[PDB]
Design a protein around this ligand. Sequence first.
Ligand SMILES: Nc1ccn([C@H]2C[C@H](O)[C@@H](COP(=O)(O)OP(=O)(O)OP(=O)(O)O)O2)c(=O)n1
Ligand SMILES: [Ca+2]
Lengths: 399, 411, 958
Amino acid sequence: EALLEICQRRHFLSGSKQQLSRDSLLSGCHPGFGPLGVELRKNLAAEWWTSVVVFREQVFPVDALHHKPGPLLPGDSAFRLVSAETLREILQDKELSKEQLVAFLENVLKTSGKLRENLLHGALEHYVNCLDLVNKRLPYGLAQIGVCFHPVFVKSIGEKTEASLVWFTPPRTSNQWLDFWLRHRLQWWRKFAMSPSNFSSSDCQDEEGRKGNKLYYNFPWGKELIETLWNLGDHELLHMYPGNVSKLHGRDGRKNVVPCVLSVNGDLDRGMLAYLYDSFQHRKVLKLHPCLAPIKVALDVGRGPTLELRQVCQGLFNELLENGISVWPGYLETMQSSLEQLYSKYDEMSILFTVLVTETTLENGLIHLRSRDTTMKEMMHISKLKDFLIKYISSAKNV
Amino acid sequence: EGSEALLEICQRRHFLSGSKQQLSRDSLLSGCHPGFGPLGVELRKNLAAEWWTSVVVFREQVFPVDALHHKPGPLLPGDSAFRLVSAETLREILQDKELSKEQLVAFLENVLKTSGKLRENLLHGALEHYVNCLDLVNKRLPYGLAQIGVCFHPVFGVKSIGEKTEASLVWFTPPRTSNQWLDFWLRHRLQWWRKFAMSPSNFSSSDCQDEEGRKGNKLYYNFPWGKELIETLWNLGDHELLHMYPGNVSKLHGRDGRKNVVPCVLSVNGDLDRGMLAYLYDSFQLFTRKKNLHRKVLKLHPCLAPIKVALDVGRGPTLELRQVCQGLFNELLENGISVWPGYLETMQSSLEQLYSKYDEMSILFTVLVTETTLENGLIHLRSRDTTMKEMMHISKLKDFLIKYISSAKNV
Amino acid sequence: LRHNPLDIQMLSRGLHEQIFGQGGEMPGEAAVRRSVEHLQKHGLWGQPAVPLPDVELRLPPLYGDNLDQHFRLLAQKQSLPYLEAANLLLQAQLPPKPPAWAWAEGWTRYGPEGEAVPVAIPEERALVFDVEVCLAEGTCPTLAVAISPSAWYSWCSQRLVEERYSWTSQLSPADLIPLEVPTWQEQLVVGHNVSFDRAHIREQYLIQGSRMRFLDTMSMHMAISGLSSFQRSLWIAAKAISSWDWLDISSVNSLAEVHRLYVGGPPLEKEPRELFVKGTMKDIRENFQDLMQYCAQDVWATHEVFQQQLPLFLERCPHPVTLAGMLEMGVSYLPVNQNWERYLAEAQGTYEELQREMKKSLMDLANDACQLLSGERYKEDPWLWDLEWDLQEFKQKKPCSEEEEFQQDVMARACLQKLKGTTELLPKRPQHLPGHPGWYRKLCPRLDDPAWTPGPSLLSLQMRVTPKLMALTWDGFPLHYSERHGWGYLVPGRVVCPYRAIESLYRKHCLEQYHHGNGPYNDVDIPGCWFFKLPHKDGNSCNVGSPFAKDFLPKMEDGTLQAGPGGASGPRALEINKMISFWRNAHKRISSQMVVWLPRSALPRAVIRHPDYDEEGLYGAILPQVVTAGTITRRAVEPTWLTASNARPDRVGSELKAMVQAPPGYTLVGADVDSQELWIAAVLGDAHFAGMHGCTAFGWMTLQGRKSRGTDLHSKTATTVGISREHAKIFNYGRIYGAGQPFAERLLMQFNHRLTQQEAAEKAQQMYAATWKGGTESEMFNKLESIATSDIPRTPVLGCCISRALEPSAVQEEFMTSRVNWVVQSSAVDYLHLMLVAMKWLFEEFAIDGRFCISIHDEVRYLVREEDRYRAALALQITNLLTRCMFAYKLGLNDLPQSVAFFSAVDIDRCLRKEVTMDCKTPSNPTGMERRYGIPQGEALDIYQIIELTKGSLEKRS
DNA sequence: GGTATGGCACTGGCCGTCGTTTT
DNA sequence: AAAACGACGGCCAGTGCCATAT
Ligand SMILES: Nc1ccn([C@H]2C[C@H](O)[C@@H](COP(=O)(O)OP(=O)(O)OP(=O)(O)O)O2)c(=O)n1
Ligand SMILES: [Ca+2]
């Protein structure tokens, strides 16, 4: 598709033309993102954090390691870290053992640690200790954004950035909470969508019979899952702390009950790809939402003395940067390119506005301003620009 | 000796996590601790944001980069570093036996070769993107790539793994000015590390050289037990860059003035976890007034403290106080101010204990509302630095706080 | 020559014949009896006469019979055109001023009846020029008026008649006043304080030597009828304890007083609004006519005073060398690169960082000390008990899961808005932190301050509380401040006074081990304690300010001044203060230097061909605003550059001079006279008696001096007194300049121990006498006391008479010390003039493309191209020789030692520094100068090396 | 000895005006 | 609803030390 070519050309996805592919992007074995893609993912994660964690006092941040050592339960599909040092020291003095091959395989899968599969286990590791943070008030949650490792069908390994919220709630109001969370998540995914009808949700049941919901985005080829909500009862919590239960009770209306666990897990890489496909529509432009565009405004120069316009543009760059506006310093070298090519280049990169500064700015302070959505041209006094931009962005956030 | 109390507070107020045994000097320094508490996570986020805004955002040639956490593909056999294996094939292995005498012990060679390793530093990933990032600046030689991420280090199962989060900048320069830039960056970095420090004299630097005769510099923090490295600078030059792309060297060329040359690679790498530990140690008391004033408080910099303002409630009509508190909470959060909702907790805690707890948590200001707030809107505000309580009108609070933070940031 | 009586090595074989010639000389008076007898009684007949290798070089041809006529010839050939041009100003008369002032761009010439015609350039070989600048906008000149012999001229700036949103803040030659005359050519410009006006000329920044020269009226006023630094204050105050005839022959300061003295008539009115300093640019845009008419008065007065002045200067200094040196000495030129901007930024940043570190160190102390309010605990503290611990009362006028619930948040914020609506009950003028203590209140900037900062940002050093907060102690006793006696300390003894706390502090300090010192004043009524003043480097009964003076840094290292019981890091605070003080004082002046960045299109091609030419580099220049002869002794004055301060390891801004770097493809060649201020006196004393160098003890010591044995005057005096050689200068120059027994008394009291007490009156006998006119060190009195009391005191070498304010007829007894010192200082001035004229002649003759750069504090520097550096050195070296010869000739001596025949070494460098063999490291740049900016080390040469590299030929081609 | 210069802290004295009181 | 006023705020200038310069 042309969209992949645009992303590669404008440094959204790293790697070479040969490496990039749909399956690699979906699985998580792609070489990596470009700076623009990294900034877009950062904006997406910041928006998710703002919508989920900060405004709610029952959600706290937790950090979990990318692996855990120690004894392990056999029968899992995760990545086990084999010890190269031990086998190399053995290679120095290879022993002539006969039967111990399968025994050594059992030993290595019994002792050696393994990588991280999901953020749910790490979050549950902190249940008891974080319960103290709320004086044992049962309804609460823990949120985290982190990378996860998965196997890809010489089994390969793939990385996926995921945002996960684990909610501990009394069994009496579990289902309601689930629905509540579901609704919010869906609306959030629809908040920045140019076509919100393309985000959908469905119902599902575990093999045991536990209820849950799934969130899907209708990609051009077909629907793809981006987030899952699962009601997991209390099996995992009890298994993690066998035997005594007095250290897992939580207070709910002076009634001590064992909480039910709700797992909300949404992957940010596939969500970012979905937003890239959504923003893409005779012009080639990515109408990224203003709150998600990695670079807001493009700044350049026109015709005139280089040393004056450079100083003016540098001052404008500093002023815009001090206020939290991301700018692309295109004035560092006169592109010597027609405005058509420059406009197309900034349209492919999803830049909200383009600012042109020339000696007329020195004369009376008027700068040329070009829009992305309405492709209109305006003349504005320089000192106003900053305020205008802020207001515009704020409006886009509030509507 | 005196750090026992500091670690006790860090554990109690959820800066770290674990137990008195798991949390220790060696475990914290190596990087194999259980992890940080939510306050520790917020502190790390604040430090990372400050580093990013002081290194990357205000520069017109620095760009972000993401490097995978693992290195796939065939490897050289001598490293002996840990390896990644999927056991969905090891389970297939367990179904039979084959050449189990000597040759499948030499199969450890294949294990070494066809298994990837966990990322050990961000320098390799950054260098892997040098060619593709020349299109961002039209091949202007002075330009950099910055990243913040976790890397794994083996530590003395006989040997385990420790994870450390650090920030790295790879700066490509012209060969002639390399040292110049080095000096500059050194200065800048030192300044940055001394910006938030309450005692900047505890940060120091020292020159050094490698066995290959290349320049370098190191930054140290004076922990109570001694000086510990926290950031290192290296003038790599051309070794790795040439060793990575042999052959058509012209594609490594970049413009410096009028001359196309191969840039010198300069590396800067500062460990964020040890930086947070150093800042936590700096902000403690550890001078007769010190012997008389026993107040234990972590005087973290306002730009770094995890929690900015604490909100509470006095006795009165719970409905109206709750309404005004919810409104104030929403207003404060809308403007990038982090708040601690202490009004939900019951009044079982007295004012003195609340002040002690909030000082231990390093909260800048404590705001209290009462029915007087309903009647005229004058709330109480206690300052962490001075422990003095002023009355002040609600309508200005947000503004004031914002100004404070900004007026502390822009110094 | 090889030797002479007293066995002192003389000039080489061929050189003496080349300059002097073995004829027309007497072997002294055929008698050395007095000299030998005196050198015997003093016991100073040592003979460490190790010969120095001799060299022979063909000197450049000379003119006239002797050296004096050669120098006069070159001075006339240099100063003829400019005297001729000034004669035109003398002769001509001009019509009255125009009825109205024009409003155009650039230059306009006013006809006889005010008909203004635009012109490209004044186009005259003469001018009286004044320049005005709008200080608020920046440094770009605003308008000017020029008086020509036949017409009036007015220049109006482009920035004044055109309105623009913004202007470049980086000055360029295209934004200055032009006076270019491309290709009589020797143009002359006259003005009052003309350095300022010269700084605003377009072509004055060109690297190539400009044939135009400048002349100042204040310089001539100082030379003819100036006032000494002592005279000026009395002259102003009265407007001398026995005579006042001088009161009506000297002016001061403004051009108004100069015009009153020299011409007189209608007093010059001063503009009460001073728009060019106070008012903004729009104010000037409307007051154009009045301001320009005001400015025309200055040029008219300058013309009148120059008319009344020039003949007097031409008469007092009949020697053309003086005029040539004056013309050349005001044409300084300091190159600068973009490293100047980096230096400014780095110095300011380091200043700010260190000051912020110190201020935060005090802020933490204040925050910690704010906590003893609870339980009235401050009252028991032995330091903070005496402040104001008051509080002003604040006063005014008389489970389940939620549904959508979009209503709850909106209603909550509506309630918040309704509560906000209660602003009408608050006073319009806010209170200032009533909950804090008063002493904390004073330090907190007001909430409405436009540059408000968090916490007590007004705290700093040298305040009545900073040493109080630090809990400083002196010898184990806390400090105490009184209103009238100044800082000191409090000793325990026998609003409530904390006697017990102070006594307990003393007891806690005594375990680790009636005091005496400043008198125990009993007027400060503290019943249980005694107040002792902190001793000053001066005498007792004098108040003392901040104990953080640099004087106490070593004393603190003794272990008596401490901050341990309350804090620590006192030495660190003193270190920052010492590092900071210089920049704290000089930042406004240094940052205000007018730098004009020359664009690429007009650089000489030699500076863009070089491999070091940085494309982004900015290659500009700074023209020092030196007021030539700004002091009675005719020495140039400028507070910024003309000072004997250089890079130091500890001072942040001491790297100032190192920023004057030659442009790529150019070099600095410089020298420094080997103690000329002493050689002048030695040669005068020697020639007073007999006609051979080394007549008496002092000439013998200064000649063939030896640093190894320490027989040099500085080292000999240092070992006689026991102080360091570098600090010995004050002990000698004060004595040489007739500072007197009271000086040798008070310095000996002050400088160090064992020289105070009766020694201060009994030790100077060794340095000044032995068992009024004669005796050891007194032999000098019998020469200067004779030349400074003649009816027309004059310089023995060139021949300018002392200012009219210090004639014997005007002043008879007062200003005697300044009178005697004027001889030596003016001798140094004439040396500088002779040097400058000689090197201009040599550069013109041998086609060397260098030019004079600056003469700081008896040093001399030159900017040359790389390809000729060696030649410059050779020229410089030979120059010194002839100058010394001239001195020897003009004082009646026909010989010259080879010890003083040349400089110690000539420095070839890429920048300006005291010595090449040092690296300028400062807190502003701990990295070496060779590594922070990438500049080589440089070196210095001696005669033989330049001879060998140049093959003994000064012509370009070898 | 015998001054002047720039910087900065402290302090009385001046005018202002905003809440405050009469009419 | 008008017009006066008193206990407290910006602000210029004078007094007094200290570093630089020599
Ligand atoms: N208390 C002082 C200190 C110094 N000077 C002046 C007189 C000298 O002319 C000037 C410069 O002296 P140097 O330190 O430059 O001494 P020389 O001129 O002897 O140079 P060098 O330092 O090489 O001896 O110092 C003075 O008049 N009074
Ligand atoms: Ca000197």
